Every structure is written in structure tokens, then in C-alpha cells.
Symmetry: C3
Subunit: 211 residues, 3 copies
């Protein structure tokens, strides 16, 4: 089958939805392709919109992916590593506050290193975005989870901020953070983007996507 | 190798959802099959429900289709043309107002001619429906978008009414029109069925279905 | 094709949703796999919520399955019989009252006999469950619908209680029973589990699943 969402689109798959990709190692993977936004051809690998899915999960869970196709999910670190082995994939982050105001952030490339290197983030340069840049700090850093502490803190940031991310100590972004249904409900550390609304001021809806 | 939704149902696909058809041309086509309404086997080729998708699109977009399997879409004029080359597909239109009342219109056949003929509508007679007949006028007319005006107006109906359709000068129905959440938000030209709620009094939800 | 949901999970299908299984007879079957609950790998064959789907159906409807991938459904007695002829399927029932209290029941095995045997329930022992046992009484009984009365009563239990089930002199469980949006607007007989909330006190959400 197809290697990515751009190729599905070219062959006339014009509706956003769940499609199979054939990974380089010859394995099939269900992914959500956004065929509509910004030209289309985006592979959505993370999505937050209602708090129905628990994102405070272990190393194996984040490695393999988890969640619901109808709602919230993380595609999986190993899938992201395999997809990003070859090709150049731009990252688009989409964020929406409780007022429906949408902001964005675009990076030239996105790649994850392998499990041996703790799925370390290799991020390209920030090109444009109304949300601003809150991911560059995390470039070069290992992913850490509650049961796999690899950060640069003398504590475990996954536990501290209740998430999983390429933590330093701890973050400028935490998009896999704990869901809050409004503001009054907001956590001390939530689904935050520092240079957008700042730490402790979360978003209602989030997507991360590659093309 | 299934060619439509009734075929799928015959083979035991009894739950409404997204399936793949195979076009006579050798292309796989995700479609929504309604497997219950009036015996089931309906291919839904247009849906509106929340205003999340922009429907003011070019000739090319409408030709190839656009939208979101999870929400609102147009399956695409070339797809509809290829589906309807042979066989005779009945058309059912479903309409839901802001109160939640549902009305309907049924036509004996629905077929689109090729792109060479501007995806001209060929429509059978209205048979019955509580919505009334607001499509007959459009039978025998070419499709029109903002960048390809084939209508019977001195101006471009698609631009005037902000939609795409088999426009005359301009319409009795406009189901690809601009979304409105209420009818306080209603545009002068919206998602309209003239014999139902009238021009300028839109519907919250719409589907167009063949079989 | 894969034989069950745990085999899919095993192969990297970690997001809950609709996958195809391939039955002994080679017939591909769309099913919902829950890839999370109790470690994931559950095939959900029944789901109630909202009440958008009519569950008062014929023998042949229950045989074939009906409903909506998006919402409520019954997968099909014939499907279940086919799945369940090669063995070891634990049953898990999930119940949710009108505020959001979830209850459960587990049975070691679940199997449906063929049509000639009226899709008779063959149920293993009740292992544990906060909802208590309400299905042990229906084990060994034939399925019945309004147009096929096989029950242990001088009356027609499917019509009397407005559902379809392996009724005895009717039920200790009535999960395919009529939907109540609230109590307030409950039913003498509804989506009930006697050892739980009890007859006349329905649930809002329900799933029946196999692993
Ligand atoms: Ca640390
Ligand atoms: Ca004109
Ligand atoms: Ca009887």
C-alpha cells in the first residue's frame, strides 16, 4: 500500500479519515489522514479534544500507541520512529482554546530516533506560527514516561507534570498533559504551550500532524 | 470488489458506516453506507451537520470530492459520475431543521453526466416527500462553482449564493451552501430547500443518499 | 485475515475502533475492537447508548446484525455463532447507570449454537462482577424475537418486554430492551440487569464483549 497520506490523496483519497499505510518494514498501520486542512495529506499522530482518553501512560503504551480512533489517541513512538526513518516530514501543531480561537506552529522536519535512544526528538527549525515556538527546547531530548525517567531533572517530570514528553525539567510544551474541561478546571501543569497561553493555561483541543 | 452499498449489505455488512467500494475503473473508494434506512443499502454522498467543513470550493475540489469522514463531505462529481453511469439509483434527500424535525424528498433516478458535460444533472421524477420537490428545476443543468460558471445567470450563482450546485438563476435548492448554526445566524442564501422551509431558512443537518 | 481482536492488538493495532476479522468461511467481518479495557483485545458485539437504534427486531435481523458503527448495534447471531465455534471466548458485560456508575459481569466462556438450535446460549460460569449474575439463568435457552417465540412461557416474552434475548419466563437480563433516555422516563421492562439496578431501573450505556 501507500507510504503516507500525500500519496493516498494523489490517488484520489480526498476524505479525511482512517487509512492503512504500509510501513517500510512491510507492516500495515491504521492512521488518520487529514485530506482537507492546508492542502491536505497530513498524518495526524496525536489528538486531544474531550478528555475521554487517559494520557498518563507507561513506556510500552507510548511506544505502541493507545486511544480511540473516534476521539483521542497517540499513534505510538515506534510507529513515528519507523515512519520518520526516511523522507522529510513537516510538523504542524494545532491548538484551540475554550473560545474556539485556533493557533498553530510549524516546524520544517520531525523525526524520532529509535527505542535504544529513547525515541529522542529531532526537530527542524520553526518556520511560522501564531502559537509561537514551544518545542525547540525539547529537540535533542529523550522521551520520558512515569516508568522511564530520562529527563534532566533530579526528579521524574512525567510524574511531576502528569504526562509524557521529551521533558527537560520540565517543559515549554506538554501536549500529552492532563485534560481539563475548562479553565476553572485547569491543572497546575496541563495541555500547555508556553509561548501561546503559557504554562498552567491549557487548550480544549490539540492535534499534532505530519506531511 | 463491492460496487455499492446494497451489494455490501447482501454480503452481510449490516452496520452503517464507512466501507470501500471498487470503482469499475479499478479504484477503491471509501463511502458511507446507511445500512438501515428504509431497508438499508444507501450510499450517502453528501452530509452537512456542524459547519466544520468549507463547502465554497473550486471545480477541482468538487470534481475530486472533499471533507471529513467523521463529519461533513462531498464525495466528488467524478465519483458520482462513475457510480451512476449504469444502473438506476434512487435519490433520497434528508433534511433536519433546528428544532430536530426531519423531512425528506425522493426522486426516481439520479445520474451525473461526465466532466465534458459539466457533470450535468439527470434527475427522475419526484415521487414523494414531506420536504416537497426543490430539485426538479435543477434537472438537466450543468454543475457550477466559483471558478466555473455554467449557469443561466448573467452573474455567477456560486459566488452570489456562496455554494456549488446545478444552478439556474439561481436555485430552488442549495445544500452545498454556507452553514448556519441557527437561524439567528442564517445567511440570505444558505443550506436551503425552497419547497420546505424556503430560501433563507436553512437546515441544521442534511444528507443526500443514493441506491 | 486475523481471527480475533487480541491477534490484531498483537500485530500493532493499538487504537480501539473498527477492524475486519476473517471468519472460517472466509467472509470478512467488520467488528469493534476495544484495545484498552483490561489490557485490550475485546470484540464488542453489542452496544447501547443514546437510543438512536431500534432494537425490537425480527429473527432474521438479529441473525444478520443491525445498527450503526458510530453508535448502537447488535453484531449478529450468525456472526457470533461462527466466531464462537472455535473456542475460548470470555464474556464481559459493562453497565452504566444515569450518573455514570459503571458495573461489570464476567463469565468464563460464551458460545452460540447454530440456527437450527435457535442460537441457543452456551454460557460458562460467572467468575466475578460488581453487577452480579443475571445471565446464568439464560444459559442453555434458545434466543427469541417477536416473530419467533422459543421461550419457556405461555406468553411471548420478546413482545411482552419489547426486546429479544434468550428469554426463559422472560428475564433476569434484558439488555436488548427498549431504550430510556432517563428514569424518570423508564419502562416497566427495559435495559435491565436484575442483580444490579434491577428490573424497572435501566442503564444509560451497555456493552457486551468477548475475548
Ligand atoms: Ca529525572
Ligand atoms: Ca452565469
Ligand atoms: Ca412463549
Amino acid at each position: 500500500g501507500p507510504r503516507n497520506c500525500r500519496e493516498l490523496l494523489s490517488q484520489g483519497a480526498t476524505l479525511s479519515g482512517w487509512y492503512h499505510l504500509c510501513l517500510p518494514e512491510g507492516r500495515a498501520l491504521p492512521v488518520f489522514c487529514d485530506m482537507d486542512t492546508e492542502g491536505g495529506g497530513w498524518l495526524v499522530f496525536q489528538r486531544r479534544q474531550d478528555g475521554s482518553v487517559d494520557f498518563f501512560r507507561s513506556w510500552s503504551s507510548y511506544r505502541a500507541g493507545f486511544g480511540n480512533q473516534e476521539s483521542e489517541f497517540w499513534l505510538g513512538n515506534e510507529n513515528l520512529h519507523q515512519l520518520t526513518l526516511q523522507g522529510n516530514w513537516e510538523l504542524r501543531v494545532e491548538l484551540e482554546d475554550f473560545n474556539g480561537n485556533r493557533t498553530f506552529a510549524h516546524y520544517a522536519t520531525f523525526r524520532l530516533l529509535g527505542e535504544v535512544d529513547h525515541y529522542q526528538l529531532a526537530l527542524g527549525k520553526f518556520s511560522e506560527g501564531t502559537a509561537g515556538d514551544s518545542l525547540s527546547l525539547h529537540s535533542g531530548r529523550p522521551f520520558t514516561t512515569y516508568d522511564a525517567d530520562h529527563d534532566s531533572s533530579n526528579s521524574n517530570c512525567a510524574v511531576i507534570v502528569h504526562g509524557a514528553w521529551w521533558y527537560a525539567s520540565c517543559y515549554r510544551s506538554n501536549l500529552n498533559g492532563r485534560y481539563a474541561v475548562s479553565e476553572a478546571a485547569a491543572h497546575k501543569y496541563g495541555i500547555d504551550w508556553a509561548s501561546g497561553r503559557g504554562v498552567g493555561h491549557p487548550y480544549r483541543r490539540v492535534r499534532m500532524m505530519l506531511r
